Amino acid sequence: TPTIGMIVPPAAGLVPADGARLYPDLPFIASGLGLGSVTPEGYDAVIESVVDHARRLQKQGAAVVSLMGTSLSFYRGAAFNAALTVAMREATGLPCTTMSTAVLNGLRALGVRRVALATAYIDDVNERLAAFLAEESLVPTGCRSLGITGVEAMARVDTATLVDLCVRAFEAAPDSDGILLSCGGLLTLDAIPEVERRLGVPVVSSSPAGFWDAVRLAGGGAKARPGYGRLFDES
């Protein structure tokens, strides 16, 4: 059974709880970046830090590495994500991926072209992720946010609150094939099937999608626990 390595933003470097539950029998390890919003040391220093943490995971026995950070994966667009992926792969000799690649793969697997975006965080996250999706020829149809800033760190948002968010996002953009939920706080898994039940359209949650994508990359053919929505039920 291959170990799955994840690079996460906070220095604490914990494996995210919101996804680990999908795969209770698989070993995950994580390495935390601790980077600031801006890094005065410059662009090379940011890339070096990502690459160093990928090496650390390789040395600790990871069989694949996923960059599980929203800003690094999405905020500079798809070409940057691809270049950083190759830099990671060339640094480690391991299959490497990211959260944005995972989200693209999830929406593709579900046949989603027109997407409504929802977040528990600020508008800017939806705008960045929408621009990224649009550049990849998907069609953002609408954006809804809760504005809870603490979700950039340790905040947990109630399932019912996340469900209302996604439902209202879709009702405002009812011409959508599906919904992308990002920055939803510590736990989002429970909202997914409930939203899908109420709307009849699939939901991709960015962090759980990164788990699914890494497990797929790993090549074991392990299935997620059932009951967490179309993407995980079907793969």
CB-based contacts of 8, cutoff 8 Å, min separation 6: 14, 15, 16, 30, 31, 32, 33, 68, 69
Residues 13, 30 contacting (CB under 8 angstroms): yes
How would you class 147 by CB atoms within 10 Å of its CB: exposed for 0-12, middle for 13-18, buried for 19 or more? exposed
Spatial distance between the Cα atoms of 196 and 234, rounded to a whole number of angstroms: 14
Residue 181 CA to its chain's centroid (Å) = 9
CB count in 10 Å sphere of residue 224: 23
Asked if 229 and 22 touch (Cβ cutoff 8 Å), the reply is no
State the Cα–Cα distance between residues 85 and 65, nearest whole angstrom: 10
CA atoms of 210 and 231, how far apart (whole Å): 12
The b/e string for 36-73 (b: 16+ C-beta within 10 A; e otherwise) is eeeeeeeeeebbebbbebbbbbbeeebbbbbbbbbebb
- CA-to-CA dists, residue 133 to 9, 40, 44, angstroms: 22, 29, 26
| Residues 152-185 as b or e (16 or more Cβ within 10 Å = b) | beeebbebeebbebbbebbeebeebbbbbbbbbb
Q: Kindly report the number of other CB atoms within 10 A of residue 221's CB atom.
A: 8
The order of strands in the sheet holding 114-119 is: 139-145, 114-119, 178-182, 203-205
Over its C-alpha atoms, the chain yields an Rg (Å, rounded) of 17
Residues 6+ apart with CB under 8 A from 77: 131, 132, 135
Q: Which residues of 103-125 are buried (b: 16+ CB within 10 A; e: fewer)?
A: bbbbbebbebeebbbbbbbbeeb
- In the chain the domains, ranked by start, together with CATH numbers, are 1-235 (3.40.50.12500)
**Coil vs helix vs strand at 188:** coil
Structure-determination technique: X-ray
Query: SS3 for 56?
Result: helix
